[PDB]
Amino acid sequence: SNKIEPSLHSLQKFVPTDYASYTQEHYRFAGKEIVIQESIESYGAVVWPGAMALCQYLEEHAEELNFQDAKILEIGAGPGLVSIVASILGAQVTATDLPDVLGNLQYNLLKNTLQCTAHLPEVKELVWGEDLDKNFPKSAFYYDYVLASDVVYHHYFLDKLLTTMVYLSQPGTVLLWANKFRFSTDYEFLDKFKQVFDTTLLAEYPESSVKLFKGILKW
Amino acid sequence: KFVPTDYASYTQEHYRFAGKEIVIQESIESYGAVVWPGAMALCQYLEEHAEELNFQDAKILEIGAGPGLVSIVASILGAQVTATDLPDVLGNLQYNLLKNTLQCTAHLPEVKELVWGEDLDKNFPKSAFYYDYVLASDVVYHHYFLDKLLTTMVYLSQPGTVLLWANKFRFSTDYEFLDKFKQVFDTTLLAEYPESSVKLFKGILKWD
Amino acid sequence: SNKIEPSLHSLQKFVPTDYASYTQEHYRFAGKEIVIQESIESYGAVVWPGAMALCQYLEEHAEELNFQDAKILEIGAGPGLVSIVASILGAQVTATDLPDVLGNLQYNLLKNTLQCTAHLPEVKELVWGEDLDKNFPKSAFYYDYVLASDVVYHHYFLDKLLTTMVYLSQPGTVLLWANKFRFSTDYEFLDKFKQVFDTTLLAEYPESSVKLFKGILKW
Amino acid sequence: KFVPTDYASYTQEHYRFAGKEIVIQESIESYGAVVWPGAMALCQYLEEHAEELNFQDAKILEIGAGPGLVSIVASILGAQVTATDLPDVLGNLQYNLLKNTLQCTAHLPEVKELVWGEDLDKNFPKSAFYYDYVLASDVVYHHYFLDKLLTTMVYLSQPGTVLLWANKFRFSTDYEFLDKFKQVFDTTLLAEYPESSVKLFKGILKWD
Ligand SMILES: Nc1ncnc2c1ncn2[C@@H]1O[C@H](CSCC[C@H](N)C(=O)O)[C@@H](O)[C@H]1O
Ligand SMILES: Nc1ncnc2c1ncn2[C@@H]1O[C@H](CSCC[C@H](N)C(=O)O)[C@@H](O)[C@H]1O
Ligand SMILES: Nc1ncnc2c1ncn2[C@@H]1O[C@H](CSCC[C@H](N)C(=O)O)[C@@H](O)[C@H]1O
Ligand SMILES: Nc1ncnc2c1ncn2[C@@H]1O[C@H](CSCC[C@H](N)C(=O)O)[C@@H](O)[C@H]1O
Where are the domains of chain B? Predict the structure, then answer.
């Protein structure tokens, strides 16, 4: 092969990124300046408001959440801001999404965490409702925390989303889900979520119509 | 003319729609020589809704027709069908379309080149080409012609034209395309199959 | 695999591009607006003055050069502007460079030629002086034209460069080489080039200290 | 402490420099557990130029020392050597360095963590760490620490310090690094091996 940054090899195994359209966007969380490649004006991944909210919550509740060495999975990670912040806070982070997102997700993770966080993040395809037992078998993959931000949108496969949330929530797992409430379907999803998860409203961000929920699975 | 691309990997695949047993020559070496999940769902819809749609004698254009199953089904149902794709796809498209429609549908279907967003005014002038329906299946995926695709869909959508678009949803970009489609078309979800991640939409061009 | 633009699969097989540093630069040659990803301020490939000069020559001498269906190889192609222009003019273009250049080279070629030129360009590693018989055997790879722009720079392996130029110049092959004359080593290389190639000065670009040479191999 | 990374793929590789037969434990699973072409060329240079360089009792730091061949050779030649790398590389680096220098060179070499550009003021204060030579081999390649690398080279280059840097040239970025190195160091090409694409430079920090 070529003598390159070894992390770049995993990047080469994802769908390529249409980078002409992507620009460097700057954030600051958990004491660090963060740079995210996003495609704001054309096709490609972007940071959503739910991410901004969840990142604020994580930086502010870091001591309580005890992310140091926690095993974390993010569903619908997008460009990766939340997974980056979780990694800065010391978690073992697996960031997941659809195949066209994974390259830029991995790139963003590398650019913000390589040799400067406790654990190198992992990037993996996870299509909601598909191949869960095959790729994320409960018996081999317990997560202390499952993160999700702005994964509820009317055109997504939302029962597959709920099924995935449930699948990844074992006894002890804490699910942190932030969303902007844009449409009636979002409200309807919250009612479905509350039926199966013991649900707590942790924070409200009225300025962005974002709410942050904790879900632990009812026994 | 059109001659099929000379693949050594052609297979004869067997389908049944609108009451006819249909054979489609396919090759995995080209997306356009493969029947995709959107095609199956759209064929099932056309077969089940033929009465409502009044395809009898309707003028229809299919974009990205690939191996031609949807165009065959539309011809079987009595439409005047124009099947379009990239120049290299046309040979096998015409072969399949003719094998399945010659002397057995109401109207012989036509095959024409239509590269998305290229020379639409010159190749398909509105002064002479009006479609009652535009059909599209599995044309949205992670490729570099998404804007040109939407432009083409808009172009072919004169007032009165109905667009029927089926697609498997695979990529973040597919959802972005859907959002852009809804900005320009009054959109109705006709059917959804979460197991196969397929949606089928009607689009009517917005004027307001 | 994934249902993606099929050209993107070849892109995934090259060293990844550090795209945060790359910006879209605009050129106009051979009647077309061209967009090139370049890394001007940091590590990554850029367009050199020799490219600008050679592109001007190609657009202006298109009829004479008869690039339609010509088999062309570019050595040290960089971000790919020259190979793009050659492809627009109708040539079968093989663009070559060191492994860290090939991804962005291929990307630039795709963004400017996919479904809009006569022949899809090829991208291949070609390290000067290495693996020539193995990867570009004269008996299977005859080129009508070999292109090179600003490939002469003092810190490169310039005898390996000359050896490569010679290797790729069969009877009938026309070598078009543009360079800015920056250093004494550049002048010295020109003297070496003239010793082995029948050399003609085709054009001088005094405004950028660029000269464009034709070389045909002495028999 | 430092313990070698637990690879199942360690091999015992055999070198001869400065008159000693040297054994280096290597693993292809880490760049830092492999001897690279720059190392060989730099060792050959140090062996051939030892008289001129007055390494006897010289204080020397190696950055990116990897499996430690260059540091071993420098110790053999009588220098006080500090070998540095990433924390995961240090175990095998110390193992090799000790196996080859314990009770048989003038000065026992030291192994210390030095992640390029990280906490240099805190970990290697100038108030207490002056190197007569800084050594580096094959530390330039297509990685995301090139600026930090150069910063580190500059940091360790106090007035009087000589930097010796050997490298295989593989990538366009390697040449860009060389251009940036020459902006900040008065640079001399000590040796060049086109067949193996290796160059060896001396750098002295510029003040003018
Ligand atoms: N069925 C599915 N499987 C996996 N991911 C999906 C999905 N449907 C949508 N997604 C992903 O969910 C994300 C929603 S957008 C939110 C992105 C990110 N969490 C942020 O807040 O910035 C997108 O990245 C999208 O690709
Ligand atoms: N830029 C472009 N212009 C015209 N057709 C294109 C195109 N890009 C892709 N296509 C065509 O779109 C099709 C996508 S695959 C879908 C084929 C068929 N509709 C089915 O569902 O089975 C291929 O036939 C491909 O050749
Ligand atoms: N030994 C070698 N083998 C292959 N390419 C080399 C090389 N040494 C340098 N190069 C390449 O030669 C190019 C010189 S810069 C010129 C780039 C381009 N032709 C333009 O004019 O814009 C770089 O892309 C560099 O990576
Ligand atoms: N950011 C960083 N800080 C410190 N060392 C680094 C580094 N990035 C890479 N390295 C080290 O640089 C070395 C490059 S390989 C060269 C090893 C040795 N000098 C030889 O020539 O054989 C590896 O040991 C690697 O661990």
Answer: 1-208
